[PDB]
């Protein structure tokens, strides 16, 4: 079954602003998603220090960047702590409320400071018409979150191949944003914004 939810009003407003504002510096989305992955890897690494069984779902802590010109997608994969169903439906949005209000006040400021308000994920909509999030947290099931904005998102149990643990952010890119599938563009962005991330970042090459 697919459940459909309304974004909190302030998050719907933020998403419309990101989608509708003229802003050429769209590449900051990738640094924000890599930062989220790094934070998630930090969290599971920390938790493993007192409960080693937390890594039974996979010992490798890494980030993969996977472009697909065929699917017109850029996928950011991590083996971090992952998100629970409650994370996806309510709890992360609840935390994002205060940051969203503060960010939207500041804009009224540059869109590139979005990460300093804890809502960097939504910068994905600078480049993506739809975002699909596949995520697996220890002691919860594997879920697919999805939204093309417009005020709603869906959550379902994922039937795709299992992940073990972590999060895959699948960016279904807008037609005019296919530069983010080019190897040299991704390398340039990571080198400029994410050169000091403390986990291996592997940029997959297309076949
Ligand atoms: C999808 C939606 C619920 C809207 C979201 C996603 C984020 C950012 N984020 C929070 N926890 C995360 C983990 Cl565990 N991993 C990664 N990669 N990202 C994470 O915030 N909200």
Curated annotation (Swiss-Prot):
It comes from the Eukaryota. The modification N6-acetyllysine is found at residues 43, 69. ISGylated. Residues 1-207 are annotated as: Interaction with NR3C1. The TPR repeat-binding motif mediates interaction with TPR repeat-containing proteins like the co-chaperone STUB1. Molecular chaperone that promotes the maturation, structural maintenance and proper regulation of specific target proteins involved for instance in cell cycle control and signal transduction. Undergoes a functional cycle that is linked to its ATPase activity which is essential for its chaperone activity. This cycle probably induces conformational changes in the client proteins, thereby causing their activation. Interacts dynamically with various co-chaperones that modulate its substrate recognition, ATPase cycle and chaperone function. This is Heat shock protein HSP 90-alpha. It comes from Mus musculus (Mouse). The gene is Hsp90aa1. The chain holds residues 16 to 224 of 733 of the full protein.
């Amino acid at each position: 079954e697919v459940e459909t939810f309304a974004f909190q009003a302030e998050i719907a407003q933020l998403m419309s602003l990101i989608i509708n504002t003229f802003y050429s510096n769209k590449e900051i989305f990738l640094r924000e998603l890599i930062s989220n992955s790094s934070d998630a890897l930090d969290k599971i690494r920390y938790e493993s220090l007192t409960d080693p069984s937390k890594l039974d779902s996979g010992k490798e802590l890494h980030i993969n960047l996977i472009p697909s010109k065929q699917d017109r997608t850029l996928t950011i994969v991590d083996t971090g702590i992952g998100m629970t169903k409650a994370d996806l439906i309510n709890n992360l949005g609840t935390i994002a409320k205060s940051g969203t209000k503060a960010f939207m006040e500041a804009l009224q400021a540059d869109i590139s400071m979005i990460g300093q308000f804890g809502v960097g994920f939504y910068s994905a909509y600078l480049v993506a018409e739809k975002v699909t999030v596949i995520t697996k947290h220890n002691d919860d099931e594997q879920y697919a979150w999805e939204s093309s904005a417009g005020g709603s998102f869906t959550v379902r149990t994922d039937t795709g191949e299992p992940m073990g643990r972590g999060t895959k952010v699948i960016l279904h890119l807008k037609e005019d944003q296919t530069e983010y599938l080019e190897e040299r563009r991704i390398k340039e962005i990571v080198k400029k914004h994410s050169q000091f991330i403390g986990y291996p970042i592997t940029l997959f090459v297309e076949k």
